[PDB]
Subunit: 161 residues, 3 copies
């Protein structure tokens, strides 16, 4: 039972032309709209969490932190990540590595990726070499391209201890 | 050559407002429309199969079970899964673990996941701990959100014997 | 640090009704439009590259080959792949296996997959058994289904040397 694979996927619709400014990978990114979600609305962490729990066959964030429950209204996605990893460790697994892809027309994710990596390496208690983050656009096609929300895909490897 | 990775992806358009009621992960889920496909139309099994065959570098379900061939009109996706695994075993591989994500606005996948896991653990001849299933919506965005079909992504790890 | 996982994702919008004819997985496929990209516009290689670099926590193709830089206007995606792998080897990793899924309504990818596999096995310097390629459509749904562009997802396993 040496190694386990996991996959995550999250999308959030953009809000009004208010503020937010969208938080992603625990980083506050200036933008003229934020994302609409029951929680912090951080698609990168949501997708990373789902990957982790999925690898551990623990379901997903829903299965750990009921979406219905008012205790998680606006809750910090970094907190959820951190709890999820505590459970994974409990079960005798440890992060191998993590690869994330943000899918967004705008804003540019590039400048914020180093800090995102810092946050995750901190949260999954590991060296920053086990964390990789990418962005791409869909060349203006589909709802991400039409500019309506952003999406995120994650892929994870867990190692036995 | 210790371990091999695989990825799958399937989508089916919804039919009329007839019946179906859609079958997914081998589970019959009540819903006012079913999916339109040449076979059973089970996106979770289709995507899981593709992942498995992909990891084994065996192509995909097309390469094993010609879509053109009338012998697979309405064929049980569980049967196809089962044959595909027989071939994978033949080649000296065995499931490590499987993680699936269903992408759908409605109906709720939650209540049916335990049974889906039972079906796969049965079919891939393994303990149910090596099988993980998740759902998410795309927050009403895109064709899954517009309610037009459902999509499924799968990720697999094969181990050498 | 035995094995590392990676994920890639690319999409390109179709051009006019001119020529192109679209190049994918290094194969020239007859079609009445080609893809619109700053480079060769080969979504299969782009996604494969991103997976590789992602597994190596090296960022993505952007981080190696600035999109802004005029030296990569129309550049061969096979060249980029090849350079990326040189860097991965430099860091003590080697391909385990690769699985790719092309997502397209038309044209049919089927007949070209053997040759695509030849190109990659050549480029990643390995036996063709470590390379798997698939296509699917989205049953005419979404922008791939509406026929507006094609998309590609890749998944990779790197082994330590």
């Amino acid at each position: 039972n040496a190694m386990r694979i996991g996959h995550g996927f999250d999308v959030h619709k953009f809000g009004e032309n208010g503020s937010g400014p969208l938080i992603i990978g625990g980083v506050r990114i200036p933008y003229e709209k934020g994302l609409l979600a029951h929680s912090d609305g951080d698609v990168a962490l949501h997708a990373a969490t789902d990957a982790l729990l999925g690898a551990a066959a623990l379901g997903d964030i829903g299965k750990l932190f009921p979406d219905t429950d008012p205790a998680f209204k606006g809750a910090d996605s970094r907190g959820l990540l951190r709890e999820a990893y505590r459970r994974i460790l409990a079960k005798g697994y440890k992060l191998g590595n993590l690869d994330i892809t943000i899918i967004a027309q705008a804003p540019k994710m590039a400048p914020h990726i180093p800090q995102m990596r810092v946050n995750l390496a901190e949260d999954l208690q590991c060296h920053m070499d086990d964390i990789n983050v990418k962005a791409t656009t869909t060349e203006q096609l589909g709802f991400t391209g039409r500019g309506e929300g952003i999406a995120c895909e994650a892929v994870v490897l867990l190692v036995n201890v």
